[PDB]
């Protein structure tokens, strides 16, 4: 019931222009509608690829919805001037007059949030975007922002994009309550923990095999290792894999599939409120594999219990949902 | 360095009028200053006892600072009218014209927070209290409240009273950052987890011994059991007890003492910001025992590591700091 959005992060990085176009064709041919990219993804090659797929983005004669973000990393801030530069560039790349969703990618702890939101309003007034979004803000920062917008009559954020998966559930305690209260819908990223929950890695690979992927041989490799590559995580994947063979046997699904099905059927996400899962992939064979799992049904209760047991294993060493 | 406040919950319940007066005398004779009670504590007998100790409370010729609260349980709400009835009664009981701190005991999910705060302001304008407080609100509810007060020119809350102890640290992740941002000081309750961290119980008592205390034979017995009486908690106390004997030997302190010393020396509480620990007791022998531990010095690092290891044991099954 929960929506599916296309994660365009690896477009320009692991997937070339052709592979990315193929993936977008596949995604849309399953009736899905929305795509997530960002100013910063693959040095801007992501937004430029999508902008050149002739999707007439931002138009009225247009079925596809597009999402982008502005960050306060590198030279950039979320101060008014930088904020504009980043969006205006995203637009020129995407070859469109406006985006459907515009996120603040992360908190800019050096810029008062008031200044940023006023600037967001002024940009909304100019029709550069439809909906405002937040990502990686703490629950309480969201509460502040929404209250400031109500009282200053600025556009309220209506979508939160956050780190959520079967073995990473910090968002549940405070963020979700908060989001439901202020009426934001939640879009999940890292739904496979970068691929860790596909079960294709073993802990001992950090010392030896080091397979070129999300966790090895790129700029952000180490960050992702500090996030998800813990011993207790690999215990938890094993625990689920054993529970899968036990309850399903020979007919057992891949735990790529199991992990995605957890998000769609057994998480706190709710189709009713417009929540979505942002799917990640580095290849077409992976997307087809994942889109299938999206449509698959719910899991036996004994497996959902095992996921829960695995989460309890790692909860103490869980990464923060906020920067 | 962190302050000490007297928990007056058991006054009228486990401690009679005489025992409570004795405890207040002892507490003040160590140079401490502030006392925490509530409208609801022991059906009002707490506030009435304190009011009859001739402390000339709320007066100018008065060394002691007094704290009370209004709840939205039972008939009561935090709507303006109820709010007044509760405070006005607290005053008549305490025999004083104003309280030094006035908490909203818990969130009233059936009353818009705006209505409540306006009423709090109007009551502050009338000089019924000095400082406004919150308790058991989610970090993000606090952020909302403070922002509404700034923008509506109402009194801001300046003290948060929250559930905090060596084996219960959920407040650390989001609440504390938030509190430091809005300038609230934190007062810890449940510092001994209701007495569980005194190490006087063993898990197997629920089935047999059931010793009349915080955890047995009262209205709230079962709530406290659902909060702290878990198997993994008792593991953790054992882990600390072994670490104490290991690093200190024969000269090892009681882990009533160790637990309190953790709050005062090794927690996130900071004397600098005016943070405090609210001490609980059901007898005078307990208070003298605890007040001693308050003044004791810091702990060996190997023991602080053991507390940390114990917290990691129970973090997944940790009670929420918010209602
Ligand atoms: N702003 C934010 O806070 C964030 C937003 N996002 C957005 O959300 C999306 C989701 O995040 P992401 O980390 O991609 O989510 P995932 O947890 O699903 O990670 C996707 C990764 O998992 C692996 N994978 C994908 N498909 C398969 C498969 N079929 N079988 C085995 N492994 C597979 C791939 O890793 P590998 O290359 O190792 O094979 C792929 O790169 C991103 O695309 C991006 O648009 C992402 C990160 C941050
Ligand atoms: N803001 C809020 O929502 C809350 C506020 N409060 C406040 O917090 C204060 C402190 O909380 P409280 O839970 O009472 O504090 P603790 O967590 O320290 O628990 C106190 C209880 O533990 C036991 N105990 C005390 N001293 C000893 C000792 N020396 N050796 C062994 N056991 C001991 C006693 O329980 P027993 O005799 O029954 O075994 C005592 O009644 C309260 O008094 C109250 O003012 C309390 C709850 C909620
Ligand atoms: Ca282990």
Domain annotation for chain B: domains and CATH numbers? 1-323 (3.20.20.100)
Is B144 in Cβ contact with A139 (below 8 Å)? Answer: no
Separation of alpha carbons A27 and A63, rounded Å? 13
Contacts of B318 (CB under 8 A, 6+ apart): B168, B169, B170
The CB-based long-range contact list for A54-58 (8 Å cut-off, 24+ gap) reads A55/A24, A56/A96, A57/A94, A57/A95, A57/A96, A57/A99, A58/A91, A58/A94, A58/A96, A58/A97, A58/A98, A58/A99, A58/A100
CB of residue A20 inside a 6 A radius of ligand 1: no
- Helix A139-152 to helix B139-152 angle (10° resolution) is 30
Within a 13 Å sphere around the CA of B291, how many CA atoms are in the beta-carbon half? 20
CB of residue A227 inside a 6 A radius of ligand 1: no
Separation of alpha carbons A290 and B146, rounded Å? 44
Residue B41 bears catalytic tag: yes
In residues, how long is chain A?
A: 323
Is A315 in Cβ contact with B311 (below 8 Å)? Answer: no
Alpha helices by DSSP H, B126-163: 139-152
Q: Is A218 flagged in the annotation as binding? A: no
Yes or no: say if A221 and A215 are a contact pair by the CB < 8 Å rule: yes
Q: Residue B209 has which token pair? A: 């011994």
Within a 13 Å sphere around the CA of A132, how many CA atoms are in the beta-carbon half? 22
The CB-based long-range contact list for A182-185 (8 Å cut-off, 24+ gap) reads A182/A142, A182/A143, A182/A146, A182/A156, A183/A156, A183/A158, A184/A134, A184/A142, A184/A146, A184/A157, A184/A158, A184/A159, A184/A160, A185/A158, A185/A159, A185/A160, A185/A273, A185/A274, A185/A275, A185/A276
Pick the closest to residue B92 from B65, B126, B57, B124 (CA basis): B57
Residue A288 DSSP class:
H
Separation of alpha carbons A83 and A119, rounded Å? 8
Separation of alpha carbons B55 and B63, rounded Å? 8
Residue A57's SS3 state is coil
Q: Judging by DSSP bridges, how do beta strands A129-135 and A99-104 pair with one another?
A: parallel
Task: Determine the residue among B108, B117, B138, B140 to mutate to test chain A binding: the one whose Cβ has the most chain A Cβ atoms within 10 Å.
Answer: B140
Task: Determine the residue among A174, A176, A230 to mutate to test chain B binding: the one whose Cβ has the most chain B Cβ atoms within 10 Å.
Answer: A174
Pick the closest to residue A95 from A131, A130, A123, A68 (CA basis): A68
- With 0-12 / 13-18 / 19 or more C-beta atoms within 10 angstroms meaning exposed / middle / buried, residue A169 is buried
Yes or no: say if A197 and A256 are a contact pair by the CB < 8 Å rule: yes
Of all protein residues, the one whose alpha carbon is nearest to atom 46 of ligand 2 is: B189
Q: How many Å lie between the centroid of ligand 2 and the Cα of residue B15?
A: 13
The structure's method of determination equals: X-ray
- Helix B171-182 to helix A139-152 angle (10° resolution) is 40
Residues B249, B255, B258, B261: is their CA dihedral positive or negative? negative
Residue B281, chain A, CB below 8 Å: the answer is no
Separation of alpha carbons A63 and A81, rounded Å? 31
Separation of alpha carbons A48 and A260, rounded Å? 29
For residue A320, list chain B residues with Cβ-Cβ distance below 8 A. 173
Q: What is the experimental resolution, given in Å to one decimal place?
A: 3.0
Pick the closest to residue A139 from A89, A175, A102, A113 (CA basis): A175
The CB-based long-range contact list for B16-21 (8 Å cut-off, 24+ gap) reads B17/B49, B17/B52, B19/B283, B19/B284, B20/B49, B20/B50, B21/B49, B21/B53
Pick the closest to residue A120 from A157, A67, A168, A76 (CA basis): A157
B104 bridge partner residues: B70, B134
Residue of B nearest to A171 (CA): B174
Yes or no: say if A139 and B174 are a contact pair by the CB < 8 Å rule: yes
Burial letters A61-84, b for 16+ CB under 10 A, else e: eeebbbbbbbbbeeebbbbbebbb
CB of residue B218 inside a 6 A radius of ligand 2: no
Pick the closest to residue A181 from B117, B138, B184 (CA basis): B138
Q: How many cross-chain Cβ pairs, A to B, lie less than 8 Å apart?
A: 61
Residue B157, φ and ψ in degrees, nearest 5: -70, 145
Separation of alpha carbons B290 and B256, rounded Å? 7
Yes or no: say if A314 and A232 are a contact pair by the CB < 8 Å rule: yes
Yes or no: say if B68 and B99 are a contact pair by the CB < 8 Å rule: yes
Separation of alpha carbons A164 and A224, rounded Å? 14
A70 bridge partner residues: A104
Contacts of B117 (CB under 8 A, 6+ apart): B145, B148, B149, B152, B154
CB of residue A107 inside a 6 A radius of ligand 1: no
Q: How many Å lie between the centroid of ligand 1 and the Cα of residue A254?
A: 17
- CA dihedral of residues B227, B228, B231, B232 (deg, nearest 10): 100
Q: How many Å lie between the centroid of ligand 1 and the Cα of residue B246?
A: 47
Pick the closest to residue A249 from A300, A213, A306 (CA basis): A300
CB of residue B155 inside a 6 A radius of ligand 2: no
Separation of alpha carbons B322 and B142, rounded Å? 11
CA B322, chain centre distance (Å): 13
Is A138 in Cβ contact with B174 (below 8 Å)? Answer: yes
Of all protein residues, the one whose alpha carbon is nearest to atom 31 of ligand 1 is: A198
For residue B312, list chain A residues with Cβ-Cβ distance below 8 A. 316-317
Q: How many Å lie between the centroid of ligand 1 and the Cα of residue A194?
A: 5
For residue B142, list chain A residues with Cβ-Cβ distance below 8 A. 140
Yes or no: say if A117 and A154 are a contact pair by the CB < 8 Å rule: yes
Yes or no: say if A67 and A103 are a contact pair by the CB < 8 Å rule: yes
The neighbour count for residue A285, using CB atoms within 10 Å, is: 9
Q: Is B150 flagged in the annotation as binding? A: no
Separation of alpha carbons B250 and B262, rounded Å? 20
Residue A48 DSSP class:
H
Yes or no: say if B95 and B50 are a contact pair by the CB < 8 Å rule: no
Q: Is B136 flagged in the annotation as binding? A: yes
The neighbour count for residue A219, using CB atoms within 10 Å, is: 7
Pick the closest to residue B42 from B84, B9, B5, B20 (CA basis): B9
Separation of alpha carbons B184 and B133, rounded Å? 9
CA B45, chain centre distance (Å): 18
User: Minimal Cα–Cα distance from B322 to chain A, Å?
Assistant: 9
Residue of B nearest to A174 (CA): B138
Q: Judging by DSSP bridges, how do beta strands B99-104 and A276-279 pair with one another?
A: unpaired
- DSSP states of A230-254: -HHHHHHHHHHHHHHHHHHGGGPPP
Contacts of B109 (CB under 8 A, 6+ apart): B72
Q: Residue B215 has which token pair? A: 């955890």
Q: Judging by DSSP bridges, how do beta strands A276-279 and A185-189 pair with one another?
A: parallel
The DSSP H or E segment spanning B82 is helix B80-94
Separation of alpha carbons A265 and A253, rounded Å? 15
The neighbour count for residue B189, using CB atoms within 10 Å, is: 20
Separation of alpha carbons B120 and B157, rounded Å? 10
Ligand nearest to the CA of residue A194, numbered in listed order: 1
Q: Residue A305 has which token pair? A: 């219990």
Within a 13 Å sphere around the CA of A97, how many CA atoms are in the beta-carbon half? 5
The neighbour count for residue A91, using CB atoms within 10 Å, is: 20
Pick the closest to residue A14 from A280, A291, A293 (CA basis): A280
C-alpha distances in angstroms, B205 versus A240, B131, B190, B296, B313?
34, 42, 21, 31, 21
The neighbour count for residue B183, using CB atoms within 10 Å, is: 12
Residues B132, B135, B139, B140: is their CA dihedral positive or negative? negative
Separation of alpha carbons B3 and B31, rounded Å? 11
Residues B55, B58, B59, B62: is their CA dihedral positive or negative? positive
Q: How many Å lie between the centroid of ligand 3 and the Cα of residue A313?
A: 9
Residues A53, A54, A56, A62: is their CA dihedral positive or negative? negative
Q: Is A249 flagged in the annotation as binding? A: no
C-alpha distances in angstroms, B190 versus A90, B148, B277?
51, 30, 9
E strands in chain A? 3-7, 34-36, 65-70, 99-104, 129-135, 157-163, 185-189, 276-279
Residues B187, B188, B189, B192: is their CA dihedral positive or negative? negative
């Amino acid at each position: 019931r929960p929506a599916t959005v296309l994660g365009a992060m690896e477009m320009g990085r692991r997937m070339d222009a052709p592979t990315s176009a193929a993936v977008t064709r596949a995604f849309l041919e399953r009736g899905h509608t929305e795509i997530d990219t960002a100013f910063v993804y693959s040095e801007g090659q992501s937004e430029t690829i999508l902008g050149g797929l002739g999707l007439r983005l931002g138009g009225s004669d247009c079925r596809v919805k597009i999402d982008t973000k502005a960050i306060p990393l590198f030279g950039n801030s979320l101060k008014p001037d930088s904020l504009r530069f980043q969006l205006e560039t995203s637009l020129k790349r995407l070859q469109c007059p406006r985006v459907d969703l515009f996120y603040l990618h992360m908190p800019d702890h050096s810029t008062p949030v008031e200044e940023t939101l006023r600037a967001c309003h002024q940009l909304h007034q100019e029709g550069k975007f439809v909906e405002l979004g937040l990502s990686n803000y703490a629950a309480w920062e969201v509460a502040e922002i929404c209250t400031l917008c109500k009282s200053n009559g600025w556009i309220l954020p209506t979508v939160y994009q956050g780190m959520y998966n079967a073995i990473t559930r910090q968002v549940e305690t405070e963020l979700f309550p908060c989001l439901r209260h202020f009426g934001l819908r939640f879009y999940a990223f890292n739904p496979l923990a970068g691929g860790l929950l596909t079960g294709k890695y073993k802990y001992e690979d950090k010392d030896g095999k080091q397979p070129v992927g999300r966790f090895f041989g790129n700029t952000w490799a180490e960050m992702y290792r500090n996030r998800y590559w813990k011993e207790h995580h690999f215990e938890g994947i094993a625990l689920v894999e054993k529970a899968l063979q036990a309850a399903y046997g020979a007919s057992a699904p891949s735990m790529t599939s199991a992990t995605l099905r957890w998000m769609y059927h057994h998480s706190q996400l709710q189709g009713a409120h417009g929540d979505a899962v942002i799917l990640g992939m580095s290849s077409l064979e992976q997307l087809e594999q994942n889109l299938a799992a999206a449509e698959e049904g719910p899991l036996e209760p004994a497996v959902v219990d095992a996921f829960n047991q695995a989460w309890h294993l790692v909860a103490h060493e869980c990464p923060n949902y906020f920067r």
